[PDB]
């Protein structure tokens, strides 16, 4: 393959030599006759001297050693100096590679080339499966779905990982190899283009492996957030937020907790009047929710006493009711009550018409972000806008958090320990730099995993519960991966410094990396290909045919 190219250049140098050497005049003196000694071209040389010619150009590393020379002793006899079998002898110490002929036994060699084909397919089968899944998700009528957009970026990380290994293998097959005895000798040397490419590939690969667990952390946070209840607390928490010390607002009041007010004139020790009362003793999520839990019931009470707002509240489902309560929380009974045509539409179950009517007002102008999430809640009737708010965070805890660790690790590697393709066994920076964030991710994925089971018992015991419900269906995918991947990558690294290479360690190596190669299809299958919703949309697109 790669040796065949070198063989043609070597041969060419050989013909170029024989042709060069023919045109020179015969020698008057007794010299070592000119020869191509299989390595370089050598002129007639006087006896008792060491001739020289620059390092032959056919060598893959010619440019690095073009300034260097090979030498050859012409012996007292008039004959060149030979080696033990009478072969040509020279000193090409200078021209020698910056690498090693690593000899690999016939049966160990055939074995690694067999077990290489296993991992090359596993990743390619995970590649086609991931890129099909992306073609299924992104090309189609889930075009703007928030739940899929997390899956899509997970799949892209596993596409990155998989893509990086194929590049690396493809570059390590460049390596020059030949049959020396029964052993196969493989050269460590790689060309500068081949060095750079596989280095970048290794960074991408290390960035992918941190991104995988950062995007499986997002997949777990998703269910934890998505499945909390969800409540009006979290809604008004995302719309406004929690606080404990007071601060001034648009009107200049003691605003505290979640959109609550303590006093009526601008004062601090007079704001204490209501703060001592509602606790009733001598500021927390255990304490100061008591302020928010009065304000909701007060807002709910006021809505029932308001004649324009009550039959709209009555007519609405539980989740859209929380959206109306929100609107009052912001404005009040009187303000909301004056959305007379928008209200009429929500009472009539005309959500898309209400939504366009609400956006036309000077509420959506004064707060385009909050009004947009509230209007969506009316539009659709789920907590989707508030799940979506957390997405832009999850992009930067899926992509940016790996980049915070690895890119400086890529800078570190460059300046200290600069091997051709970085899969090093040093342990100084593949523990702290690249393994710490995957450990810290798995750590948080475990604290969540248990918090999901307590969250799913509470869901399934209440009336929010059925088994064919997509929220439970999606937990069948996520709750399998965190134990599958969390075990497989900590038991690996825990026991990855125990054997020297080895025969049992290299047998361990292949049982693990073959599971890791199909890892990118497993994910593609249980999320994308096994989803009910996606299976039905294929049965709609394929049945229009």
């Amino acid at each position, epitope marked *: 393959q790669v*040796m065949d190219f*070198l*063989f043609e250049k*070597w041969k060419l140098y050989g013909d170029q030599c024989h042709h060069n050497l023919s045109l020179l005049p015969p020698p008057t003196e007794l010299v070592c006759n000119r*020869t191509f000694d*299989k*390595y370089s071209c050598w002129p007639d040389t006087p006896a008792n001297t060491t001739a020289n010619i620059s390092c032959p150009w*056919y*060598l893959p590393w010619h440019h690095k050693v073009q300034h260097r020379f090979v030498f050859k002793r012409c012996g007292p006899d008039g004959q060149w100096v*030979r*080696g*033990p*079998r*009478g*072969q*040509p002898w*020279r000193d*090409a110490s200078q021209c*020698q*590679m910056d690498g090693e*002929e690593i000899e690999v036994q016939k049966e160990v060699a055939k074995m690694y080339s067999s077990f290489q084909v296993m991992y090359t397919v596993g990743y390619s089968l995970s590649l086609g499966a991931l890129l099909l899944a992306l073609a299924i998700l992104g090309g189609l009528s889930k075009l703007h779905c928030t739940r899929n957009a997390i899956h899509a970026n997970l799949f892209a990380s596993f596409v990155l990982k998989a893509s990086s290994v194929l590049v690396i293998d493809g570059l390590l097959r460049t390596r*020059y190899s*030949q*049959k*020396i*005895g*029964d052993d196969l*000798s493989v*050269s460590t040397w790689l060309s500068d283009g081949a060095v750079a490419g596989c280095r970048v590939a290794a960074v991408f690969m290390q960035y992918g492996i941190v991104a995988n667990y950062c995007w499986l952390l997002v997949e777990g946070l998703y269910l934890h957030n998505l499945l909390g209840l969800a409540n009006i607390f979290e809604m008004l928490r995302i719309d406004e937020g929690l606080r404990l010390k007071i601060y001034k607002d648009t009107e200049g009041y003691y605003t505290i907790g979640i959109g609550h007010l303590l006093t009526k004139s601008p004062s601090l020790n007079a704001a204490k009047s209501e703060l001592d009362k509602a606790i009733g003793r001598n500021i927390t999520k255990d304490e100061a929710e008591k302020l928010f839990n009065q304000d909701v019931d007060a807002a709910v009470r006021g809505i029932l006493r308001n004649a324009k707002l009550k039959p709209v509240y009555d007519s609405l489902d539980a989740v859209r009711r929380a959206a109306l309560i929100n609107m009052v929380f912001q404005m009040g009974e009187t303000g909301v009550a004056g959305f007379t045509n928008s209200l009429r539409m929500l009472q009539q179950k005309r959500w898309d018409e209400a939504a366009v009517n609400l956006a036309k007002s000077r509420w959506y102008n004064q707060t385009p972000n909050r009004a947009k999430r509230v209007i969506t809640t009316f539009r659709t009737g789920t907590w989707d806008a508030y799940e979506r708010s957390f997405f832009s965070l999850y992009l930067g805890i899926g992509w940016g958090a790996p980049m915070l660790f690895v890119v400086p690790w890529a800078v570190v590697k460059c300046l200290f320990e600069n091997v051709q393709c970085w899969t090093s066994n040093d342990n100084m920076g593949f523990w702290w730099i690249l393994r710490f964030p995957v450990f810290l991710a798995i750590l948080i994925n475990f604290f969540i995993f248990v918090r999901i089971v307590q969250l799913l018992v509470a869901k399934l015991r209440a009336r929010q519960m059925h088994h064919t419900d997509y929220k439970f269906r999606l937990a069948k995918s996520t709750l399998t991966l965190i134990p599958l991947l969390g075990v497989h990558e900590v038991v690996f690294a825990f026991v990855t410094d125990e054997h020297a290479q080895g025969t049992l360690r290299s047998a361990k190596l292949f049982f693990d990396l073959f599971l890791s190669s199909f890892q990118g299809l497993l994910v593609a299958v249980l999320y994308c290909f096994l989803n009910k919703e996606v299976q039905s949309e294929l049965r709609r697109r394929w049945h229009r045919w």
Partner: antibody
Amino acid sequence: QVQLVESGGGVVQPGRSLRLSCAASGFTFSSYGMHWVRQAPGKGLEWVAVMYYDGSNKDYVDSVKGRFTISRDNSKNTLYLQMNRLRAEDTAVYYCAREKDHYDILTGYNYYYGLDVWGQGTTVTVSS
Amino acid sequence: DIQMTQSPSSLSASVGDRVTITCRASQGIRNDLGWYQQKPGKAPKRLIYAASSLESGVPSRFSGSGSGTEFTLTISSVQPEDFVTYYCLQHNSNPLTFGGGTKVEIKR
């Protein structure tokens, strides 16, 4: 089918000459080094000469240097041993063997695997 | 010149016996050694190559071991066909040199 057939042997007188021949079949003759080895009647094996494809590289045992000459016709897949100025001590059975070598282009070093396949032998007998 | 000393010249065994022809070298010939068997009247046949690497279709009784300067051929269970002559050959330097040879005679 890899085999080597010698011929040329027979009775010859001290001082006169003989060209033994060794005929390769079943393999690529050009790529293998080749060797003659003799074994005198009572005694054991004795290497006598080698020749490689080039064939700049050639060698002989001391007792036959200048007296004996090795050659090969790659077109006829034949190896030869021109024996001149024969003495009594050249009385022997003359085997021909091949050696496989390997050149490492990346290092310019050569590896040698020894005499794997041998001829049947041709008796040479030097008597007046 | 690398002198190869073959020990012993003749040895006496019975079918079954473990037999150990050794063969020493006057310099470091590395692993470049091969063991031949010569049957009476027949051209020698090579058994071990590269010191220990058994040739194709040679019984597993035969085994080679040694490196640098000490080299050992070993038949674990000498059969009737093995009572013949054996030589080491060195191919590390010209002139290629043999050991003196070892006749394995049948004890009685």
